[PDB]
């Protein structure tokens, strides 16, 4: 069984599996630590989910202080459930920190070699992908719901890194908390799209006619291996956003009214 690569520390799940690879701050937030209430209780870091902005701004400031990464150096994207990956850095510092529309336009993955920035991505069920090539000082995040998964957003990131001279055998990938097969049931449209890009069987369990439980974390792991990532360079959480009702917001479990966690990565 793949060991859990994240450790809960004061409300934050830090990517402890990568502590010896390089001096980075990486992890995934939880519902704990903020001042939001109701459907957004407590650490809602999402600006586009109808929470009161003052609470989201404060929650962001709280995280910035916990991570020692000032808001002015954060980079956020306007996620659109597609496969666009953008290299970011100095000129994009501050993008989306206070207004979602100010985020990197229609982008689901971001990467950088800049040591002062904090890359961020928002989640409430979708798969958080993390990338690190320690030898090249390159870090990245990609948002993979079913659409980004089957549109091969992980491969988009890897291909861009290959063009920057980074071999796929030097890229470490982490897969964070997401909706698991215990709670995520999809139709033939999703399963077929996954079959089109996965060589071999897509792991799935039929629940009823045209209804299949699927593990999008494992689908992304398989696609990463098939894109040249070494199996031993992938770490994967088993945490389910829907099942963990005290740790995570879940778009599916909370019926579309919920907050957002952030995935984050930056140099210490
Ligand atoms: Ca296939
Ligand atoms: Zn999503
Ligand atoms: Zn579950």
What distance lies between CA 19 and its chain's CA centroid? 18
Q: State the Rg of the chain over Cα.
A: 17
What is the Å distance from ligand 1's center to 109 Cα? 24
Is the torsion defined by CA of 43, 46, 52, 53 positive or negative? Answer: positive
What is the Å distance from ligand 2's center to 1 Cα? 26
Specify the number of domains making up the chain. 1
Q: Assess contact for 36 and 51: CB atoms under 8 A.
A: yes
Question: What's the token pair of residue 71?
Answer: 């808001």
Mode of pairing for the β-strands spanning 74-75 and 118-123 = parallel
CA distance 107 to 129: 14
Other C-beta atoms within 10 Å of 176: how many? Answer: 27
Q: Assess contact for 120 and 98: CB atoms under 8 A.
A: no
For residue 8, the SS3 value is: strand
* CA nearest to 40, candidates 29, 53, 48, 31: 31
Question: What's the token pair of residue 246?
Answer: 């005290």
Identify which ligand lies nearest to the alpha carbon of 261. 2
What is the Å distance from ligand 3's center to 182 Cα? 4
CA distance 174 to 179: 16
**Domain boundaries, position 34:** 1-268
CA distance 76 to 156: 18
In what helix (H) or strand (E) does residue 261 lie, and over which residues does it extend?
A: strand 261-267
Resolution of this model in Å is 1.6
CA distance 201 to 170: 27
Q: Assess contact for 142 and 131: CB atoms under 8 A.
A: yes
Q: What own/partner pairs with CB < 8 Å and gap ≥ 24 does 48-55 have?
A: 48/100, 48/122, 49/124, 49/257, 49/258, 49/259, 49/260, 50/257, 51/259
């Amino acid at each position: 069984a793949m060991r859990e690569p994240f450790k809960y520390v004061d409300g934050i799940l830090y990517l402890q599996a990568w502590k010896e690879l390089g001096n980075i701050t990486a992890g995934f937030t939880t519902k704990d630590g903020g001042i939001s209430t109701g459907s957004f209780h407590a650490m809602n870091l999402g600006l586009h989910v109808n929470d009161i902005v003052e609470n989201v701004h404060e929650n962001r400031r709280i995280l910035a202080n916990k991570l020692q990464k000032p808001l002015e150096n954060w980079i956020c994207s306007e996620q659109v459930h597609a496969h666009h990956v953008e290299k970011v850095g100095q000129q994009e510092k501050g993008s989306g920190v206070y207004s979602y529309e100010d985020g990197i336009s229609k982008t689901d993955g971001i990467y950088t070699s800049n040591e002062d920035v904090l890359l961020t991505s928002c989640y409430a069920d979708c798969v958080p992908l993390y990338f690190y090539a320690p030898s090249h000082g390159m870090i990245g995040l990609a948002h993979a719901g079913w659409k980004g998964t089957v549109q091969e957003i992980a491969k988009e990131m890897i291909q861009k890194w290959n063009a920057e001279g980074i071999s796929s055998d030097e890229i470490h990938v982490a897969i964070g908390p997401s909706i698991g097969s215990c709670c995520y049931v999809v139709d033939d449209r999703v399963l077929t799209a996954a079959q089109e890009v996965v060589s071999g069987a897509v792991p799935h369990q039929k629940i009823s006619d045209g209804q299949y439980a699927i593990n999008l974390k494992e689908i992304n792991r398989i696609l990463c291996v098939q894109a040249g990532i070494k199996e031993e360079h992938i770490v994967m959480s088993s945490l389910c956003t829907s099942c963990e009702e005290q740790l995570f917001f879940s778009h599916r479990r909370d019926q579309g009214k919920t907050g957002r966690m952030l995935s984050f990565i930056g140099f210490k």
